[PDB]
């Protein structure tokens, strides 16, 4: 059988579930909230740290540091707790009390940066901290660091291949770091040699930078409600050579479809999960895709978002 | 050594740019936009809920439009305004780039 | 590979994790928050309904009804959503907004009963609802219904057996319905024939009815903070013939040990999860168990409890 | 046909039983205890404040002791009081039995 030596080794083997009342029954949703910290990011919280060990830079005395206001903070926090590392996270002071509590319970050291400075404020402070003692501190860099797409190629991708028995046609994922999309497509297209596969990125309509990039247009990001994607730039861990297509989704489309996942499928889903499934729904309007097998990623659980507008009407 | 006279359209673009920078770029305008992105506006309206996200979009669209108007204009006063707009846009984009991830 | 036809079929195969900084390293924690609705109750939310289908009682037009203020509501809610059933839950009006929101998003119909009447108030209303149309409504009855321990015997137990390669010595589980404890022990003792196994129930010190029952004492329940266990009576789905021992845990012991699971092991844990691990810790104080392999159940994730006193600082 | 005179101890137990029933058993005392069980107790400082849990424990323990005192007493007034105590204990136990599961 299996005894895991610590919780970081429990990542993956998330289930692939057929959506019955959403779409025509060919939409297969990979539920990535079945993970140790309950998001797709668990996968990179582990291997970003695993990799750091193997490269030897992370050793006694060395502490981890990353700017993040999202799930990546939760994934790094629990892995540092399980493998015994000192963790420091930078985020803007806009972060809610409850989210702070969650990170502290996992033993993370939190540095709240100035709210108006936003996310650049946190990224700056993170660099300043590493700059104060470059020997002591280690920056994980979720947008650039290649460990991020690598697990998706080593785990996320392989699972999708195996569970579908090579019969996946379209793969749909929202892009925060791009790691999932990049790594999975890199496994299915590259390693199993299926270049047929349609990789579809999902972004918000209010920050449509992937569509702008693929059209040679200028990059013009904006604020959106889909938490976890819509970085507002082309992250280094997004490889566009693997991206066949991109579908933009409105705030309302993602929220309404997230609610459909919970009520019609029994699947707890956050906004980005509704977004990706709504893209699969838009793709089925085109009649060339109606008969094709679609695997879509479901990054987080709605429970994490319980205080937000995702739950509105009583 | 050429310099062109600004028209009403261009003088207007310069006026609006510095206005929306003073009034629509306050700290609570940015903080509000960030909290709306986290899903906690709060979405209820007892009146004046303000939808900071929407306002900030309008602020961006506006700045981007006036910037377009002033981009190739041969007047130095237009180019200084174009710089201030470009700067403001970068202030906003740096605040929300990579947020929530 | 595997494509699940609906999310209720994704239950189980929860990981068994060695606790490295808590205890001596022989405590193996089964993380039951790795489940479709993220609690050990997911297992019986599925199999209680599956069973109702197989027995034929649940058919077109028939709606589900259960009194619960706990995770069983969330487990029934998501399964009814996935298999296309109408669910009605009764709970006291003490239930918070956020928890109501969570059940409604899963499409549950919520009936809030009178706060001072408490849990009996809900149980009453549920029965009144079944009484209005006994043909239309179906009561699941988590404390009595044998499907509850059954799923733990068919899945939970086998996993503990398989993953440990028969080497589990002590099995520790907090008792809400008793289903986990009963069914797992029923698999390991009965079906794999290891009667050696020490099954340990965990209850609060403030409602210590299992200890009272094993001593022939009068049953005297009280209020406690360990959510998910401490039923305050001996539920039909707790079979005491399988229970070798019971360890009582204080509110403070559970909360402090829950905080240790998150900070020292990286494992998100609720109060009952800290309680069970604290019982394993007390068992290691006795020197006969120090070399023994301990599998302990970890029923829920601390994230569910984020607004509570579990997070005090 | 025997009846025994109650003593100071027993008359005291009868007095305390009926007091704790009007004063320490109120809807707000039971509700408070239920909410403390869910981990969300009310903050300082209110009259009849938290922990409702501790108070309700004290209330239970009290009733159980007076009931013990009055259980075998051959006086009818004692047995009626014993009933009121037994009743109150069942009121409380029905409120929290199976809660949170």
Curated annotation (Swiss-Prot), chain A:
Organism: Escherichia coli O157:H7
Family: Belongs to the cysteine synthase/cystathionine beta-synthase family.
The UniProt record lists the keyword Cell inner membrane: no
Subunit structure: Homodimer.
Swiss-Prot/TrEMBL catalytic activity: O-acetyl-L-serine + hydrogen sulfide = L-cysteine + acetate
Keywords: Allosteric enzyme, Amino-acid biosynthesis, Cysteine biosynthesis, Pyridoxal phosphate, Transferase
Cofactor(s) for this UniProt protein: pyridoxal 5'-phosphate
Presence of keyword Amino-acid biosynthesis: yes
GO molecular function, one term: cysteine synthase activity
UniProt-recorded name of the protein: Cysteine synthase A
Organism classification: Bacteria, Pseudomonadati, Pseudomonadota, Gammaproteobacteria, Enterobacterales
Pfam family, one: PALP
GO biological process, one term: cysteine biosynthetic process from serine
Binding site for hydrogen sulfide: 7, 34, 268
Entry EC no(s): 2.5.1.47
Residue numbers binding pyridoxal 5'-phosphate: 71, 176-180, 272
Pathway membership, UniProt: Amino-acid biosynthesis; L-cysteine biosynthesis; L-cysteine from L-serine: step 2/2
Gene3D superfamilies: 3.40.50.1100
Swiss-Prot record, chains B, D:
Phenotypic consequence of residue 50 to A: Loss of growth inhibition activity in vivo, significant loss of tRNase activity even in presence of CysK
Quaternary data: The C-terminal (CT) domain interacts with cognate CdiI but not non-cognate CdiI from D.dadantii strain 3937. CdiA-CT also interacts with CysK; this is blocked upon preincubation with O-acetyl-L-serine. CysK forms a complex with CdiA-CT/CdiI. One CdiA toxin subunit binds to each subunit of the CysK homodimer, and one CdiI immunity protein binds to each toxin subunit; the immune complex is thus a dimer of trimers. The 4 C-terminal residues of CdiA fit into the active site of CysK.
Protein's recorded name: tRNA nuclease CdiA
Ranges where the record places region tRNase function, does not interfere with F-pilus mediated conjugation: 1-101
Coiled coil (residue ranges): 1-97
Domain text: The CDI activity resides in the approximately 230 residue C-terminal (CT) domain; exchanging the CT domain and cdiI gene between different strains confers resistance within cognate but not non-cognate systems (i.e. CdiI-536 / UPEC neutralizes CdiA-CT from strain 536 / UPEC but not CdiA-CT from E.coli strain EC93, Y.pestis strain CO92 or D.dadantii 3937). The 82 N-terminal residues (toxin import domain, residues 3016-3097) are sufficient to translocate the tRNA nuclease domain of colicin E5 into E.coli cells, probably via binding to the F pilus.
Active site location: 29, 52, 55
